[PDB]
Design a protein around this ligand. Structure first.
Ligand SMILES: Nc1ncnc2c1ncn2[C@@H]1O[C@H](COP(=O)(O)O)[C@@H](O)[C@H]1O
Ligand SMILES: [Mg+2]
Ligand SMILES: [Mg+2]
Ligand SMILES: [Mg+2]
Length: 252
């Protein structure tokens, strides 16, 4: 009794869901294997989604769910609590032998509005789970994580004035966690993305006392009618002014 103020907290549930989906994805990878990457990716997406939706209905039956892998009935627009999930982020990388740059994203949005609780699993990295309740708090040259598939064109403009080495990595979750780890200084994206790509990484980023915003510096906004959310900057706080400034100056 009195577990907090099964019965998990929202953050504990986010972490457990991310880990559980992580393990299932690892099982799918081992069972289906890499002969047909399309088949492997589809199975991972579908099975992880099924697990997550089943558990969210069982354990949070009153909460809305927005998932990449399910139809969106928009009931969430009237809810005060919405899980925003990417059952497998970096499906491409998951489907490729030896790649560890893929993730599970589990975010809870609560009306106010904020991502209040979140977890990001990197299942191939020992199924590590970064979570909002346990994550902790000028360089002459910047390492910036960018998509290994569709890197943002805006990076080329800012590189005229800032010394930057782009670090190509798959998955939004993997790139955001690379910022937390200190493997890169920043993660920059533009050109398109969805709420579930950034919601859990943003929640973790902000809980770590780091910076997460749109490229124009405005807050990342979630549970919108159109869950397209095309650009982001996630980085150490001190680096934010430098990069947001360069982005802004690119429009001069
Ligand atoms: N230009 C884009 N438009 C829509 N979604 C994207 C775009 N670039 C990346 N994403 C998505 O963002 C996530 C991370 O992609 P990446 O960083 O390319 O591995 C994946 O779910 C991608 O499908
Ligand atoms: Mg996708
Ligand atoms: Mg996905
Ligand atoms: Mg994704």
């Amino acid at each position: 009794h009195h577990h907090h103020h099964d019965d998990l907290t929202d953050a504990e549930l986010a972490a457990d869901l991310a880990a559980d989906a992580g393990k299932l994805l690892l099982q799918v990878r081992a069972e289906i294997g890499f002969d047909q990457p399309w088949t492997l990716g589809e199975a991972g997406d579908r099975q992880a989604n099924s697990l997550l939706l089943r558990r969210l209905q069982a354990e949070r039956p009153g909460d809305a769910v927005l998932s990449e892998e399910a139809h969106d009935d928009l009931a969430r627009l009237k809810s005060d609590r919405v899980w925003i999930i990417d059952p497998l982020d970096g499906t491409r990388e998951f489907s490729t032998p030896g790649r560890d740059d893929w993730a599970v994203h589990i975010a809870l949005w609560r009306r106010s509005p904020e991502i209040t609780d979140a977890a990001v699993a990197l299942p191939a990295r020992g199924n590590v789970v970064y979570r909002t309740d346990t994550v902790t708090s000028v360089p002459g040259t910047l390492r910036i994580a960018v998509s290994a598939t569709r890197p943002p064109a805006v990076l080329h403009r800012i590189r005229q004035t800032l010394a930057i080495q782009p670090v190509s990595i798959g998955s939004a979750g993997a790139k955001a966690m690379a910022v937390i780890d200190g493997y890169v200084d920043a993660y920059l994206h533009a050109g398109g993305q969805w709420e579930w790509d950034s919601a859990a990484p943003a929640g973790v980023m902000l809980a770590a006392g780091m910076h997460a915003s749109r490229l124009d510096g405005s807050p990342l906004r979630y549970n919108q009618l159109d869950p397209y959310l095309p650009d982001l900057l996630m980085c150490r706080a001190e680096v934010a002014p430098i990069l947001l400034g360069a982005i802004a100056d690119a429009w001069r």
